[PDB]
């Protein structure tokens, strides 16, 4: 639950990193059984 | 929780068919729950352990057991891409209208996931 | 609508797999919680 | 050349984002002809 | 040492392609400049 | 810079074979440089325009022209994965020991890039 700060040069770099940051933080709301089900599916494809 | 329940959750999840049968015969809690509400059937369904899935259903496993997020074994199997397990669950009366607390039915997860074979079976079963 | 990506570097593959996972699984999150979360980002 | 700040929750999220941020900023040092040569190569593979 | 990645989502493919590119092309940068750059990151 | 030089840089880069031949016959600066030091030969080599590469070399193009980063047409072709162009450059005396200002020779970029066919030709040509 500890908070880190990144400094980013360039608007396009900020946009890319904000998109990924949002995906990583929102992914944490997904119940683990759905995450593990997704990972089973990934294992099946690879 | 129970000791045999925890062993059965673990055996069902990692796919130890023999340990599952031993635990069942010893009266292991077939509807034991892990910390997310998962039953042995959730875990075996999720992890594609078809033999363990059939054993559990024949030995009193709730086919429509609801974990802490309202997901059923059918949700997990459908999301994971385990077609054979989806069919077995349906045979034993798995509820295709079961909504988790985010309002998803199994079809929604299969369709979102691109598990087209399973999506089609669930729509047709609607 | 399924594209394929080539990655040289086991380390790079693992990073891109993590981000693939997060980009995909974030789609499951109810819009209200996404919207709540974005209204929160206005911090900075 | 404008500077943006991201706040990140969780050490593992910070590590992932710092790695990507570093790659995006360092990539900017690579002369465009090498970037365009790399992109030609990508076009050939896909 | 070449792994393959599957991506559903044209938008997600483009993002992962951008990061693939940056992860790979950053390898070309002389260590001294990488090291310089990391010694700079100590800002925060 | 020169007007015809800029047109030749653009034609060579986007692969307009005919416009290249017209510009050359009109005395277009075959060693014109864009803002990174690229000559028409750099751009055609980079973008895999083999016919334009041959035309340029026959009409006085410096095979070992060095851009602002010390990259030669052989660096770019080798990095891009254009084997046929690498061979033509080598025939016209492309310098396999040419180091850019980061100390890379063409082989280094081919090898790093995984252009194994080109890496092998460059090593053997060392
Ligand atoms: Co933008
Ligand atoms: Co870590």
Residue numbers in the entry:
A (entry chain A), D (entry chain A): 352 to 397
B (entry chain C), F (entry chain C): 1 to 126
C (entry chain B), E (entry chain B): 353 to 396
From the paper:
Here we describe the characterization of two DARPins generated against the oligomerization domain and the SAM domain of the transcription factor p73, a member of the p53 protein family. For the development of target-specific protein-based binders, Designed Ankyrin Repeat Proteins (DARPins) are well suited, as these proteins are small (14-18 kDa), highly stable and, in contrast to antibodies and nanobodies, they do not contain disulfide bonds, making it possible to use them in the reducing cellular environment without reducing their stability. DARPins are based on the Ankyrin repeat fold consisting of two antiparallel helices, connected by a loop to the next unit. For further structural understanding of the interaction of the DARPins with their target domains, we solved the X-ray crystal structure of both DARPins in complex with their respective target domains.
For this purpose, the OD of p73 (aa 351–398 of TAp73α) was titrated with DARPin 1800, yielding a dissociation constant of 94.5 nM. Titration of DARPin 1800 with the ODs of p53 and p63 as well as with the p632/p732 heteroOD did not reveal any binding. The structure of DARPin 1800 in complex with the p73 OD revealed a 2:1 binding stoichiometry (couting the entire OD as one unit). Furthermore, the structure revealed that DARPin 1800 is binding to the hinge region of the OD which connects helix 1 with helix 2. A detailed analysis of this interaction demonstrated that the interface of DARPin 1800 includes stretches of helix 1 and helix 2 forming multiple hydrophobic contacts as well as some hydrogen bonds. The high selectivity of DARPin 1800 towards the p73 OD, despite the high sequence identity with the other family members, can be explained by direct contact with non-conserved residues within the p73 OD including L380, P384 and L385. While DARPin 1800 detected all C-terminal isoforms, DARPin B9 is a highly specific binder for the α-isoform, being the only one containing the entire SAM domain. For DARPin 1800 we were able to increase the affinity from 67 nM of the monomeric DARPin to 4 nM for the DARPin dimerized via the leucine zipper domain (1800 LZ) and to 13 nM for the linear fusion construct 1800–1800. Interestingly, the DARPin 1800 seems to have a stabilizing effect on ΔNp73α as the transfection of this DARPin resulted in a higher cellular concentration of ΔNp73α. Presumably this effect is due to stabilizing the tetrameric state of the p73, making its proteasomal degradation by endogenous ligases less efficient.
